[PDB]
Design a protein around this ligand. Structure first.
Ligand SMILES: [Cl-]
Ligand SMILES: [Cl-]
Ligand SMILES: [Cl-]
Ligand SMILES: [Cl-]
Ligand SMILES: [Cl-]
Ligand SMILES: [Cl-]
Ligand SMILES: [Cl-]
Ligand code: NA
Length: 129
């Protein structure tokens, strides 16, 4: 599924991400824009052989099982395929664990490089929320 901007903002708010760990909804929408362009089926292979999955490009090194990432963990206790669903519940629940891990949203390098410190409220501007 390719979400619209305000469509995703609404879905993220419905699943309790808005101000989760103090990160406003615009932070989460911005991260999803640059990680996946709002596409739930986004995948990207890392140089180390891990893969990133879904709207928030969650990595198989730590967070999900894809059976092809040696020495990895599965701390969200999900198959990485769950992260590609039209239903964002598994991505949101796993993102809540990642953002609790100690470095907040810096876990998402695209958030650090493209969203952090910017006017992230622009990402939810106009949306009925
Ligand atoms: Cl957009
Ligand atoms: Cl915001
Ligand atoms: Cl594996
Ligand atoms: Cl594990
Ligand atoms: Cl699995
Ligand atoms: Cl959803
Ligand atoms: Cl933080
Ligand atoms: Na894994």
């Amino acid at each position: 599924k390719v979400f619209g901007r305000c469509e995703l903002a609404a879905a993220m708010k419905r699943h309790g991400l808005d101000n989760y760990r103090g990160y406003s909804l615009g932070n989460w929408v911005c991260a999803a824009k640059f990680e996946s362009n709002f596409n739930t089926q986004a995948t990207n292979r890392n140089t180390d052989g891990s893969t990133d999955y879904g709207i928030l490009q969650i990595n198989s090194r730590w967070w999900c099982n894809d059976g092809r990432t040696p020495g990895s963990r599965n701390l969200c206790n999900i198959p990485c395929s769950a992260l590609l669903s039209s239903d964002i519940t598994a991505s949101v629940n796993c993102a809540k664990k990642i953002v609790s891990d100690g470095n907040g949203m810096n876990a998402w390098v695209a958030w650090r490089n493209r969203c952090k410190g910017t006017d992230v409220q622009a990402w939810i501007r106009g949306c009925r929320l």
